[PDB]
Amino acid sequence: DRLVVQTSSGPVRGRSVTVQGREVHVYTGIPYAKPPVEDLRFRKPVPAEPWHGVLDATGLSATCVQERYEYFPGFSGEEIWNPNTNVSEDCLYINVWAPATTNGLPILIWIYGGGFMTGSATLDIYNADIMAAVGNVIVASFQYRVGAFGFLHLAPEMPSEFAEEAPGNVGLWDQALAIRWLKDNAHAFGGNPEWMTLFGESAGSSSVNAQLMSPVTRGLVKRGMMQSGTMNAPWSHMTSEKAVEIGKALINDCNCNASMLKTNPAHVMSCMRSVDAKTISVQQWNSYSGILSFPSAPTIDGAFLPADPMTLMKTADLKDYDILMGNVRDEGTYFLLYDFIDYFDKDDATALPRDKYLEIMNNIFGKATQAEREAIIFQYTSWEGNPGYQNQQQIGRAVGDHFFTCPTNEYAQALAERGASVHYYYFTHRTSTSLWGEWMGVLHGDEIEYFFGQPLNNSLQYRPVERELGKRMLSAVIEFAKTGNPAQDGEEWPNFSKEDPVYYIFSTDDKIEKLARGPLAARCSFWNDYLPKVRSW
Amino acid sequence: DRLVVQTSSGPVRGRSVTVQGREVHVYTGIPYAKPPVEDLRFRKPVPAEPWHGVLDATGLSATCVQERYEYFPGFSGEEIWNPNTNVSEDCLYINVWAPATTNGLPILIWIYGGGFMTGSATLDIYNADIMAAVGNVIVASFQYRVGAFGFLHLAPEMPSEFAEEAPGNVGLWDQALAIRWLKDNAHAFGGNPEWMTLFGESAGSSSVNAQLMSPVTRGLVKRGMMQSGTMNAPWSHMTSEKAVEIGKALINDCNCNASMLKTNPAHVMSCMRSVDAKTISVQQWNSYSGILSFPSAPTIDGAFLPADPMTLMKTADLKDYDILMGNVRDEGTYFLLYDFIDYFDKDDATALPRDKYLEIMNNIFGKATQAEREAIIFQYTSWEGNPGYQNQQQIGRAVGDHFFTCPTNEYAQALAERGASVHYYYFTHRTSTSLWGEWMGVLHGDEIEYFFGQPLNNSLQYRPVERELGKRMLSAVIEFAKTGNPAQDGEEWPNFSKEDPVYYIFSTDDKIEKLARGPLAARCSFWNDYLPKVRSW
């Protein structure tokens, strides 16, 4: 057939599409690992059984076990981020979009986010049809295990004989295996195995970070785009000891005596591999404590993550790395709405009084020193405008600043200091069809559509300015993947460094200056320079 | 004669002027105390010897012993604040401007400033010709002792027999005596002794504060205008213990064995009363330590000042007090230029680098905790504009904010909380002829001319807008003195309270909103609410 490709594991046939005047061959649902079920739950992935007879790659694959967000039942803005194929443990599958230096096309690999608890490669928003066609590049995506299925970490609690029972981070190992699979099969799809770029958003972005710097994988890919997600962010890493405690609570929460873990490991694990996945998928959420602190995250395990995400870069030198990273204007509004939904409304702004500003701020930063609490609270007191709507606005900035934008800023400075070629963007456009309330502004994840080039899709409703910005943001990705540099020629987009922290504003207003330094530096110097000093007694 | 008035001490003849179409009778140089010389140096003032034969009151009186500021030799902007009559210890004289409820005219009494070290009532800038004529009110002014001549405080260091040798604050006692003199002689000048208002600026303003709240004098005047000066400001009060140390250093600095103070007081004082005044006037300045910390200030003496300027108002209730107070835009530039003249220039702005911003800030606030130093420094870091000129600008704001505007703000809130009727202004006009550099903006003391109504003087060069604002600011004073309320009718100028901290902007631009709350509250909440908390460990 004109649509069978001969992979390292066997023959597979996809389907052919015609996007933007270009034929692309779309192969979805290719297995890259054995179905991680039965005794293979919680364990590292193992390469898939070679097959005979061409495998049907025209359907969407299953999504990894996870729970549906139903905070706004029916409301579509929430459900477009829920699974759109059935959930299953049998979920380790790859997708490749392949068009119709000399030795093959570039290959871009997407890693979705969703807080290491949720997410899926099959969401329409991640369709790489347009990107491949207009970019004339190869794009791939894949499911990786999320929640306790990917991050149950119990090894310290057992004898060393049982180390591989639940080592942790196996969702990172999934990505590693899927990435290795693509490098092995790049040439078979028309791709140049040495021309690969990772890109992802939120947790996917943090995973890109992890795949680039892990000792297990360091060297295979040196070119990556991290949208709103870096491993130094608080939600993106977790101690061994915390994971063990969260882990054994899930054990107790599924009625396997976690007290027995130390003396009879084999028995407790057998119990955990007997529980219906739906039960794990629910009870893991008991250990959800406060905002943006999920019970699953990349764990310091002395294996995939040998140390803390700020002791990684003491050492290594990144002369060969090309990095594109950035943020959106209102990273935190979405999370603030969800974790304080008693106060807030997805449609209307909330005039929040002073006492309840203190009550909410003191909640979010309740684990910081009160002298930090006091300093954050003063750094975000309003004095101009109508004070009610501004209080809510300022809590949103505080959330987004502390948890996303300024962790990104800091890592960007760290990378450029060790020699990487870093380019920084800031996404400020509020999509004209956004179904969320106006006060929530430019939402976390709002920029994904644009980098994927969905505004080129004439069947989707977008303003002509929006189509233009979509064309421009997609070309940033393609040019970066192609040359390591997002900048068009005749476009100034200089390198980002601590010495010169310039960033490119992605926006639909053409009256603004699109190169800027000051504003992000002022917001983040609070978090990255000043607040470290008040912690010192 | 048509110009002799019969005072409580004797007959005195002045001269007659015709200002703004009105005849005013000007009596300058009337003695209100014995010349405080010989054994009367350092001591409290004593009422003057009654005289026979009409006393000539047509000349300017002497100015109290003090040193000339010659930082910019020749340059007139500095010298117009230097004495314009000869300096002498024999300086305790009163001036009264008297025009040509039913029982007599209102009486306004001016107290000049100059840091309790300098200043004089005879400066042209304090001429009350226009104010009296256009206001149809009585205006008086007088010299009070400054420097060590008014504030040498040694009583704790001697036996109680010698208490009156140098009790301290005798410059405040001078004012008290001159004020009592005017109340005794109000009716003789056409004035209503019960219709008195004190007003002053800087140290004079702080003295108004002291004259209104001192137990010695509380009750005589309940209506006062404090321009840029309140007793809670750091430069405006000093412990007994500091004064004693500063005092005995001056003793040693004049070669009287201050070690002998405790055992033979009479001898050491006799030595100090033998020193040429020029020597005291110079050597007192040795104890000038850092910016805005002069060696003379109102001293906590358990007599005129019974306690600290924030424990005064725990108790008393001010239902009957009418207070008008305010500030200028750039209180601190003048002092910053003088105390760091190695960096700065009276004509041009200085592009000040980051390191030298730290070096200067760390100097000014070197006695505060470093955690306060750190917090001030962050609260005044620039991020917008060209950073060089802004650093200098921000140090200026820090100086003015901490030393003048926010001490004023705090006391204003304290007064309105105890029942006083407080009205607050903010002066923002840069006089078109100001001889100081542009970066220094609206200088401390720049508003005095306007409240005195000097822009009505057609011989002085002023823009028509400036003449208008002068007419408007003078009418604020007159209406306040007349009714306790600065506001014209048909003009909104509401009361100031912590609940509603509204202030009237005095400016020549007619496009601004002249009533404002936000900006001063944001600047001062740092000094008055937040910084108190970082001091707590």
Ligand SMILES: *[C@@H]1O[C@H](CO)[C@@H](O[C@@H]2O[C@H](CO)[C@@H](O[C@H]3O[C@H](CO)[C@@H](O)[C@H](O[C@H]4O[C@H](CO)[C@@H](O)[C@H](O)[C@@H]4O)[C@@H]3O)[C@H](O)[C@H]2NC(C)=O)[C@H](O)[C@H]1NC(C)=O
């Ligand atoms: C409006 O602006 C004008 C410009 O600034 C002011 O004019 C000034 O007016 C003063 C006082 O009238 C004048 O002062 C001195 O110099 C005079 C000439 O050298 C001299 O005659 C004055 O003194 C007399 O007064 C003394 C008091 O110490 C008495 O002992 C004597 O009896 C003696 O006769 C005084 O030393 C300025 O020179 C003058 N300057 C200019 C440039 O015109 C207005 O005063 C001012 N205000 C008003 C209401 O108009």
Ligand SMILES: c1ccc(CNc2c3c(nc4ccccc24)CCCC3)cc1
């Ligand atoms: C962590 C992050 C996100 C979720 C919920 N799913 C969402 C995701 C994204 N954007 C969203 C916008 C609105 C509502 C839910 C969204 C962006 C990609 C990751 C998942 C759950 C946990």
Ligand SMILES: c1ccc(CNc2c3c(nc4ccccc24)CCCC3)cc1
């Ligand atoms: C404390 C305060 C002021 C001085 C110097 N004299 C000055 C006064 C005033 N404004 C001035 C403006 C520029 C230069 C010197 C000025 C206003 C009234 C008090 C004295 C000395 C000590």
Ligand SMILES: *[C@@H]1O[C@H](CO)[C@@H](O)[C@H](O)[C@H]1NC(C)=O
């Ligand atoms: C998904 O839906 C139901 C589960 O309720 C199942 O019977 C069906 O066969 C599933 N479809 C696929 C393609 O797996």
Ligand SMILES: *[C@@H]1O[C@H](CO)[C@@H](O)[C@H](O)[C@H]1NC(C)=O
């Ligand atoms: C002021 O000046 C000199 C001092 O040098 C003195 O001789 C003169 O008489 C003084 N004038 C008055 C009016 O005191």
Ligand SMILES: [Cl-]
């Ligand atoms: Cl083409």
Ligand SMILES: [Cl-]
């Ligand atoms: Cl008239």
